[PDB]
Design a binder for this molecule. Structure first.
Ligand SMILES: [Cu+2]
Ligand SMILES: [Cu+2]
Length: 433
């Protein structure tokens, strides 16, 4: 059962090429309590600038940290903030402009778990609460390489094998019982459609309980889950004795932007060898429903498009020379109508600083529409509070965001979490007024 090691006291972290080093362990899971104070110093031990981003955290832009605050090698950066996020599974990872994909892919990515009264639901981390950080790699001679061509910067850098928690061909040896699996897409670009199946047997229903920004109102039974880069979905499964497989199953990846392990091919991501009898953990109710969405005062349309060799948002993209460029000025509660062009590819769009309520999916591909659970085209994952949402070519996704006036005068990136798209500039500053 290989999962990241746990630490509570994240006081000092070193950015190294292989990953984050804290208290002698690599990429540990930082576990925090809702409401606690975080004081943490980042030391840059790389040969290039970097900065840590607390993915999904409600903090100011000094603690986000905005990419403009990146530190040079040998420098340090202090983070100090109160955790006001809902209990859930978050990430910490690099955010220097133009260097994030490589640093992230070469190993700098860890989990941040936020806990709250009763949020562990009776499961124990590393026993039956299992994070599965799914990361693909392009292996050459059994070693990962990050060498995207210009066409791979446009499309995303896809690996030829899939790791779980850094482990090739991951195998989990478990006893029969209940398992909470925290599915995390830690890949640069690869999309997954995830299912758990009995080997040579039937699909195991998964009971979705939480996504990016925390618990659903109630568990939802699903047979398959789309999980794009930086999305998180926590499910509960009942495993009897036998062999089970976490698999990717076939999809149309809709690479329509420009005319080794295909995204829609079927393959095993992890194997569960279930022997013995262990604890059953009943999960009948969740005690932390997401808030209802606020009422927006204006509608703002966003078009996702390829402008030549440059991915853009409303035609705009990162100004490498001016990281404080104010691409969009916002205020109050807004409804964002995010339209992905037909000649495009799926984009997992992610907003810093402010979570998002998903209101509606329109013109989704059938493989998505078939999984929706309401009249507004919403997927089960769309029913929780989110911070990263996948928008398919031709599809319109409507979200509502509250640009809290307490954050006036700060800048927060809005960007695609396909890291090649991000390093390629598919990122703009949202300036809160
Ligand atoms: Cu983020
Ligand atoms: Cu993208």
């Amino acid at each position: 059962a290989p999962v990241p090691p746990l630490i509570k006291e994240a006081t000092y972290i070193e950015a190294t090429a292989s990953g984050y080093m804290a208290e002698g362990v690599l990429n540990p899971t930082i576990i925090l309590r809702r409401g606690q104070r975080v004081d943490m110093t980042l030391k840059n031990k790389l040969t290039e600038p970097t900065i840590v981003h607390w993915h999904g955290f409600d903090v100011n832009w000094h603690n986000d940290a905005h990419p403009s605050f990146a530190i040079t090698p040998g420098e340090s950066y202090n983070y100090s903030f109160d955790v006001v996020n809902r209990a859930g599974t978050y990430l910490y990872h690099p955010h220097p402009h133009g260097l994030t994909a490589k640093q992230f892919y070469m190993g700098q990515l860890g989990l941040v778990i936020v806990e709250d009264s009763g949020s562990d639901l009776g499961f124990k981390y590393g026993v039956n609460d299992l994070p599965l950080v799914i990361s693909d790699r392009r292996f050459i001679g059994g070693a990962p390489v990050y060498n995207p061509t210009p066409m791979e910067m446009i499309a995303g850098f896809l690996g030829n094998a899939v790791l779980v928690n850094g482990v090739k061909d991951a195998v989990f040896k478990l006893s029969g019982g209940s398992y909470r699996l925290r599915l995390v897409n830690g890949s640069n670009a690869r999309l997954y459609m995830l299912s758990i199946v009995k080997k040579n047997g039937d699909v195991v229903p998964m009971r979705l309980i939480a996504v990016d920004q925390g618990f659903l109102a109630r568990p939802i039974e699903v047979r398959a889950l789309f999980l794009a880069p930086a999305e998180r979905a926590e499910v509960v499964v009942e495993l009897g004795e036998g062999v089970y497989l976490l698999k990717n199953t076939p999809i149309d990846p809709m690479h329509l932007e420009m005319g080794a392990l295909p995204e829609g091919s079927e393959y095993t991501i992890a194997t569960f060898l279930v022997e013995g009898k262990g604890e059953a953990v009943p999960v009948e109710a969740l005690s932390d429903p997401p808030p209802e969405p606020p009422k927006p005062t204006r509608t703002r349309r966003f078009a996702l498009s390829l402008s030549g060799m440059q991915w853009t948002i409303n035609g705009m993209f990162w100004n490498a020379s001016n990281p404080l460029f104010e691409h969009v000025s916002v205020e109050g509660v807004e409804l964002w109508e995010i339209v992905n062009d037909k000649a495009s590819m799926p984009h997992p769009m992610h907003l810093h600083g402010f979570p998002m309520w998903i209101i509606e999916r329109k013109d989704s591909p059938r493989q998505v529409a078939e999984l929706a659970v309401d009249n507004r085209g919403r997927l089960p994952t769309d029913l929780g509070l989110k911070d990263t949402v996948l928008i398919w070519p031709g599809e319109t996704v409507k979200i509502v965001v509250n640009f809290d006036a307490k954050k006036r005068g700060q800048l927060f990136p809005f960007h695609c979490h396909n890291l090649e798209h991000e390093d390629g500039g598919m990122m703009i500053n949202i300036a809160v007024k």
